[PDB]
Design an enzyme around this catalytic site. Structure first.
Site, PDB file in Angstrom:
ATOM      1  N   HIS A  29      52.044  46.680  42.490  1.00 50.56           N
ATOM      2  CA  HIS A  29      52.042  45.382  41.750  1.00 50.56           C
ATOM      3  C   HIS A  29      52.525  45.599  40.330  1.00 50.56           C
ATOM      4  O   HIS A  29      53.103  44.677  39.748  1.00 50.56           O
ATOM      5  CB  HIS A  29      50.623  44.791  41.743  1.00 50.56           C
ATOM      6  CG  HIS A  29      50.035  44.629  43.103  1.00 50.56           C
ATOM      7  ND1 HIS A  29      50.584  43.748  44.023  1.00 50.56           N
ATOM      8  CD2 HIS A  29      48.943  45.177  43.646  1.00 50.56           C
ATOM      9  CE1 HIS A  29      49.836  43.762  45.103  1.00 50.56           C
ATOM     10  NE2 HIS A  29      48.846  44.624  44.917  1.00 50.56           N
TER      11      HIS A  29
ATOM     12  N   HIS B 230      48.615  48.247  31.575  1.00 50.60           N
ATOM     13  CA  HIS B 230      49.736  47.936  32.453  1.00 50.60           C
ATOM     14  C   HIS B 230      50.536  46.825  31.800  1.00 50.60           C
ATOM     15  O   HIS B 230      50.129  46.251  30.803  1.00 50.60           O
ATOM     16  CB  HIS B 230      49.258  47.557  33.835  1.00 50.60           C
ATOM     17  CG  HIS B 230      48.449  46.323  33.820  1.00 50.60           C
ATOM     18  ND1 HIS B 230      47.087  46.355  33.638  1.00 50.60           N
ATOM     19  CD2 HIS B 230      48.820  45.031  33.905  1.00 50.60           C
ATOM     20  CE1 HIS B 230      46.666  45.088  33.585  1.00 50.60           C
ATOM     21  NE2 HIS B 230      47.714  44.239  33.749  1.00 50.60           N
TER      22      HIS B 230
ATOM     23  N   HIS C 295      53.355  43.333  32.718  1.00 50.32           N
ATOM     24  CA  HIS C 295      54.003  42.342  33.587  1.00 50.32           C
ATOM     25  C   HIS C 295      55.372  42.073  32.986  1.00 50.32           C
ATOM     26  O   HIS C 295      55.464  42.019  31.737  1.00 50.32           O
ATOM     27  CB  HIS C 295      53.207  41.051  33.664  1.00 50.32           C
ATOM     28  CG  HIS C 295      51.785  41.251  34.063  1.00 50.32           C
ATOM     29  ND1 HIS C 295      51.352  41.070  35.368  1.00 50.32           N
ATOM     30  CD2 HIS C 295      50.702  41.666  33.351  1.00 50.32           C
ATOM     31  CE1 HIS C 295      50.025  41.343  35.408  1.00 50.32           C
ATOM     32  NE2 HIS C 295      49.622  41.747  34.211  1.00 50.32           N
TER      33      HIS C 295
ATOM     34  N   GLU D 227      52.981  36.546  30.991  1.00 50.67           N
ATOM     35  CA  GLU D 227      51.983  35.701  31.707  1.00 50.67           C
ATOM     36  C   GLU D 227      51.490  34.587  30.803  1.00 50.67           C
ATOM     37  O   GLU D 227      51.691  33.431  31.103  1.00 50.67           O
ATOM     38  CB  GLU D 227      50.846  36.594  32.182  1.00 50.67           C
ATOM     39  CG  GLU D 227      51.316  37.680  33.150  1.00 50.67           C
ATOM     40  CD  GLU D 227      50.285  38.079  34.153  1.00 50.67           C
ATOM     41  OE1 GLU D 227      49.221  38.543  33.745  1.00 50.67           O
ATOM     42  OE2 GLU D 227      50.540  37.890  35.373  1.00 50.67           O
TER      43      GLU D 227
ATOM     44  N   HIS E 119      48.941  44.560  28.841  1.00 53.69           N
ATOM     45  CA  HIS E 119      47.506  44.292  29.012  1.00 53.69           C
ATOM     46  C   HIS E 119      46.768  45.613  28.873  1.00 53.69           C
ATOM     47  O   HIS E 119      46.902  46.489  29.736  1.00 53.69           O
ATOM     48  CB  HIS E 119      47.224  43.676  30.379  1.00 53.69           C
ATOM     49  CG  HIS E 119      47.718  42.284  30.458  1.00 53.69           C
ATOM     50  ND1 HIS E 119      47.892  41.615  31.659  1.00 53.69           N
ATOM     51  CD2 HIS E 119      48.050  41.446  29.461  1.00 53.69           C
ATOM     52  CE1 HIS E 119      48.348  40.410  31.379  1.00 53.69           C
ATOM     53  NE2 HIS E 119      48.474  40.253  30.051  1.00 53.69           N
TER      54      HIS E 119
ATOM     55  N   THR F 213      44.407  38.114  36.066  1.00 52.68           N
ATOM     56  CA  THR F 213      45.613  37.334  36.409  1.00 52.68           C
ATOM     57  C   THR F 213      46.158  37.754  37.763  1.00 52.68           C
ATOM     58  O   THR F 213      47.178  37.198  38.149  1.00 52.68           O
ATOM     59  CB  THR F 213      46.690  37.437  35.330  1.00 52.68           C
ATOM     60  OG1 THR F 213      47.194  38.783  35.375  1.00 52.68           O
ATOM     61  CG2 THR F 213      46.211  37.059  33.941  1.00 52.68           C
TER      62      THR F 213
HETATM   63  C1  LIG Z   1      37.334  47.439  43.452  1.00 49.11           C
HETATM   64  C2  LIG Z   1      37.031  47.582  41.950  1.00 49.11           C
HETATM   65  C3  LIG Z   1      36.521  46.302  41.286  1.00 49.11           C
HETATM   66  C4  LIG Z   1      37.065  44.934  41.716  1.00 49.11           C
HETATM   67 SE1  LIG Z   1      38.565  44.305  40.624  1.00 49.11          SE
HETATM   68  C5  LIG Z   1      39.997  44.659  41.922  1.00 49.11           C
HETATM   69  C6  LIG Z   1      41.205  45.361  41.213  1.00 49.11           C
HETATM   70  O1  LIG Z   1      40.728  46.551  40.565  1.00 49.11           O
HETATM   71  C7  LIG Z   1      41.995  44.479  40.176  1.00 49.11           C
HETATM   72 SE2  LIG Z   1      41.803  45.358  38.450  1.00 49.11          SE
HETATM   73  C8  LIG Z   1      42.673  44.158  37.242  1.00 49.11           C
HETATM   74  C9  LIG Z   1      42.565  44.442  35.883  1.00 49.11           C
HETATM   75  C10 LIG Z   1      43.225  43.669  34.942  1.00 49.11           C
HETATM   76  C11 LIG Z   1      44.009  42.604  35.356  1.00 49.11           C
HETATM   77  S1  LIG Z   1      44.820  41.614  34.163  1.00 49.11           S
HETATM   78  N1  LIG Z   1      46.314  41.401  34.651  1.00 49.11           N
HETATM   79  O2  LIG Z   1      44.804  42.365  32.945  1.00 49.11           O
HETATM   80  O3  LIG Z   1      44.117  40.363  34.145  1.00 49.11           O
HETATM   81  C12 LIG Z   1      44.143  42.321  36.706  1.00 49.11           C
HETATM   82  C13 LIG Z   1      43.466  43.086  37.649  1.00 49.11           C
HETATM   83 ZN   LIG Z   2      47.749  42.243  33.597  1.00 53.33          ZN
END
Ligand SMILES: CCCC[Se]C[C@H](O)C[Se]c1ccc(S(N)(=O)=O)cc1
Ligand SMILES: [Zn+2]
Ligand SMILES: CCCC[Se]C[C@@H](O)C[Se]c1ccc(S(N)(=O)=O)cc1
Length: 257
Positions: A61, A91, A93, A103, A116, A195
């Site tokens: 992703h 990471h 996007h 985003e 992010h 997100t």
């Molecule tokens: C299984 C472990 C705990 C359940 Se969370 C599932 C998985 O670890 C997604 Se981590 C994630 C972190 C940050 C973002 S963002 N783009 O920054 O909002 C998006 C996803």
């Molecule tokens: Zn992100």
């Protein structure tokens, strides 16, 4: 499985993750005239001098630069936050073209990419517990625009050839995430969500007003990554961004006049 294609992209996510249509989803458009200055917000405290980067992973992703979060080594405090939030990973996007990729948007303006830096609230003990809490995470969002190169990004760009495909990882020690920050820590803040699936409503978003500049050659290297695994037909890792979601019953606050 979810992704960013025509058949599994953001308009499909609600079928497996109904919180996609929830009350505090991210990202959002930041209407700069509607955001209110909150003179009670504190300066952000970004304490990354002891950060310990470990590894870089292509997860299918995006790519994650992972940190040692087993101690208070790289933390975010202050601003809208109560307590101490530990850096676990960053990471990006990004787009297929320089006119899209971010985003969050600012007065409907899309940036080429968005960084992010993901942090979790140490009062919940681990990241998996923290994502179950409304104040579990703090994500520091930084816009990227195409112009001059970012020298502190180049060590990331140069390793991407070694993690081209889904599931590949490489050692990535001694990377200093302070090299990715802009000069100013002026920010907007609002309560939101992850997100990507599982879209959990656990994030205090902190979005810096000042973008960082990266070169066209740097973002071209992001766009050579693959969503696919090794020995699968190539699908370029581009347009891995969720569009802006309804603000609903939320106020975006500004740290600055
Ligand atoms: C299984 C472990 C705990 C359940 Se969370 C599932 C998985 O670890 C997604 Se981590 C994630 C972190 C940050 C973002 S963002 N783009 O920054 O909002 C998006 C996803
Ligand atoms: Zn992100
Ligand atoms: C290693 C080097 O690549 C990290 Se970029 C960096 C830039 C500025 C500052 S400071 N002390 O805030 O002026 C610290 C670090």
């Amino acid at each position: 499985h979810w992704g960013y294609g025509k058949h599994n992209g953001p308009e499909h996510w609600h079928k497996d993750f109904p919180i996609a249509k929830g009350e505090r989803q991210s990202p959002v458009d930041i209407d700069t005239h509607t955001a209110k200055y909150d003179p009670s917000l504190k300066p952000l405290s970004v304490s990354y001098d002891q950060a310990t980067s470990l590894r870089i992973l292509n997860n299918g992703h995006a790519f994650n630069v992972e940190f040692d979060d087993s101690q208070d080594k790289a933390v975010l405090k202050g601003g809208p936050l109560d307590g101490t939030y530990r850096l676990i990973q960053f990471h990006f996007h990004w787009g297929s073209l320089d006119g899209q990729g971010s985003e969050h948007t600012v007065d409907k303006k899309k940036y080429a990419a968005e960084l992010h830096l993901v942090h979790w609230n140490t009062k919940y003990g681990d990241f998996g517990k923290a994502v179950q809490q409304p104040d579990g995470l703090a994500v520091l969002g930084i816009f990227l625009k195409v112009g001059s190169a970012k020298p502190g990004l180049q060590k990331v760009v140069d390793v991407l050839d070694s993690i081209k495909t889904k599931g590949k990882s490489a050692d990535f020690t001694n990377f200093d995430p302070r090299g990715l920050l802009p000069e100013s820590l002026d920010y907007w803040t609002y309560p939101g969500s992850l997100t990507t699936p599982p879209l959990l409503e656990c994030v205090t978003w902190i979005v810096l007003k000042e973008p960082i500049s990266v070169s066209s050659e740097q973002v071209l290297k992001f766009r050579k990554l693959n969503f696919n695994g090794e020995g699968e037909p190539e699908e370029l890792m581009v347009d891995n961004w969720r569009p802006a979601q309804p603000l609903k019953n939320r106020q975006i606050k500004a740290s600055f006049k």
